[PDB]
Each structure stands twice: as C-alpha cells, then as structure tokens.
Design a protein around this ligand. Structure first.
Ligand SMILES: O=C(O)[C@H]1O[C@@H](O[C@H]2[C@H](O)[C@H](O)[C@H](O[C@H]3[C@H](O)[C@H](O)[C@H](O[C@H]4[C@H](O)[C@H](O)[C@H](O[C@H]5[C@H](O)[C@H](O)[C@H](O[C@H]6[C@H](O)[C@H](O)[C@H](O)O[C@@H]6C(=O)O)O[C@@H]5C(=O)O)O[C@@H]4C(=O)O)O[C@@H]3C(=O)O)O[C@@H]2C(=O)O)[C@@H](O)[C@@H](O)[C@@H]1O
Length: 228
C-alpha cells in the first residue's frame, strides 16, 4: 500500500480537525480514519513528507474539510467573533498536466458559498492584465455570478519550490500572506456578517478542466487550522 499521511507526525494536528471529502463533497474518511492510516492514490504521503491530493473530473475534489477537534462534527464559525481564525500552509504546486486549468487549494466556505478560494490557474486576465501559471485569490463579496461579486487577486506566480500561505480572518477582515509577505491586507468580509457556518478547506478541488480525465495534483508540506 501507499504510505499513509498519518504515518508521520507532521499532519496529525490538522487531521484531528478534518474529514476528507473525495471524490465529491461526499465523505471519504472521518477524522479518526485519517489519523488511523486512511490512504489511497488520491491521498498519500509523498516523498516521505508531503500530504498529496490528486483528483480528476469537473468540480471533483480531494479536500480536507474543517471539523470540530477530537472527533467532533462539522464546525462553523463567524468572520467577526473577535478571534482570529487562521489557516497556514506550505504547498508545492507542481506543473499541472494538460487539461487541468484551475485547482483550488485552500478555501473559506460556509453553508451557502465560498468566501475565499486560493487557486492555481493556468491563465487568466485580472483587471485588464494577463497572468499565466499563478496563484490567485477569489473573494466573494456577493452571492451572484457577475464580476462585482468577486475580488480576484494575483497572489504570486507559481514556484517550483514550496510556497507558504497564511489566511487570517479577524473582525470581518481577511489577510493573506504569501511566503511571509502580506499580499491581501484586510479585504472586507462584512457581506458575510451574521453567518455562523464558515469553515476552512484545503486540498485539491478541480475547476473547469478541459479534460475529465486530467488529474490535478497538489502537495502540502504543512497545513494547520487554528483559532487565536
Ligand atoms: O469559473 C467561473 O465560472 C466562476 O467560478 C467562481 O468560483 C466558483 C468555483 O469555480 C467553483 O465552482 C466553486 O464551487 C463551490 C460550489 O459552488 C459549492 O459552493 C460547493 O459547496 C460544497 C462545499 O464545498 C462542501 O463540500 C459541502 O459539503 C457538504 C456536503 O454537500 C454535504 O452537505 C454534507 O452532508 C453531510 C454532513 O455530515 C452534514 O452535516 C449532514 O449533517 O450529514 C451529511 C452526511 O452525512 O451525508 O455536509 C458537507 C459539509 O461538510 O458541509 O457541499 C457543497 C456542495 O454543494 O457540494 O463548494 C464549491 C467549492 O468547494 O468552492 O464555486 C465558486 C463560486 O461560486 O464562487 C468564481 O471564480 C467566478 O469568478 C468565476 O467566474
């Protein structure tokens, strides 16, 4: 069998606060299953150190979904409870195979929609400017589909080496730090005031592929979800 992610110590904190959704939003593994050696080609320990996610198909996923710690049920929190909700990661985004066009690697999501997606995208115009092979944040400030519902940002060009991300939510404001540099500073999340169902996700969620068989692949050297 492939080497289980839980066979080393590095990811036990987040696995203790997560369920795995694969290949859809349906449950693949409970937190205890993840802590107890759940493994497959979709989710395995890579190079002896990376929690790697693989998924093919339009809107299919291999994603960790934040849970109440120590075997609890699905968590939900508010963007303005006065604390800081923080997701931190270190991610190696390899060159994606042909047919893979956008891969969501971290999210904030609620009962209704994604407040935030951090995704790799092959090519995209943002605010009149073309970018290629880069990491993007997409923030919802509305629930519609038109441009004004989103704030989209070039976070960084994709690197060969590990890229660190810190997502901070405090007092209805979102900060994203990339390789130690603040890139998004205090994006307004006020539209979500009143919502108590937010949670982190991370892994690989495949968006608008050109081929249903092309497999997205994302490696995490680190991932943690904390409340301060
Ligand atoms: O490209 C463009 O055209 C535009 O795209 C825009 O971004 C898009 C993006 O491309 C992508 O489409 C994205 O997809 C969203 C999607 O719209 C939807 O919100 C989806 O929701 C998922 C959740 O992520 C989550 O997995 C959730 O999980 C649920 C399960 O569905 C199920 O309810 C489950 O039930 C069990 C639980 O135990 C329950 O508590 C219950 O008690 O028991 C059951 C059980 O035991 O069975 O509970 C799960 C849970 O954990 O909560 O399921 C939903 C789902 O509907 O499947 O999330 C994806 C996403 O991951 O982001 O949407 C983006 C968008 O609309 O913004 C923009 O980029 C735009 O600019 C472009 O133009």
């Amino acid at each position: 069998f492939l080497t289980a992610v839980s066979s080393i110590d590095t990811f036990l904190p987040v696995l203790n606060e997560a369920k795995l959704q694969w290949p859809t939003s349906a449950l693949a593994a409970s937190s205890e299953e993840l802590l107890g050696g759940y493994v497959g080609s979709q989710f395995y320990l890579q190079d002896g150190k990376y929690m790697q996610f693989q998924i093919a198909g339009s809107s299919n996923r291999c994603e960790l979904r934040q849970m109440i710690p120590d075997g609890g049920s699905e968590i939900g929190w508010a963007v303005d409870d006065g604390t800081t909700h923080t997701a931190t990661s270190s991610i190696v985004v390899p060159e994606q195979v042909d047919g893979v066009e956008e891969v969501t690697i971290m999210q904030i999501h609620s009962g209704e929609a994604p407040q935030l997606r951090i995704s790799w995208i092959r090519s995209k115009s943002l605010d009149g400017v073309a970018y290629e092979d880069f990491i993007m944040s997409t923030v919802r400030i509305g629930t519609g589909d038109s441009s004004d519902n989103f704030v989209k940002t070039h976070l960084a060009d994709r690197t060969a080496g590990a890229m660190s991300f810190q997502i901070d939510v405090k007092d209805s404001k979102l900060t994203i730090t990339v390789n130690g540099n603040v890139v998004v500073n205090g994006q307004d999340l006020s539209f979500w005031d009143g919502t108590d169902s937010c949670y982190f996700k991370a892994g690989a969620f495949n968006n608008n592929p050109t081929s249903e068989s092309a497999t997205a692949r994302i490696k995490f050297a680190a991932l943690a979800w904390v409340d301060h």
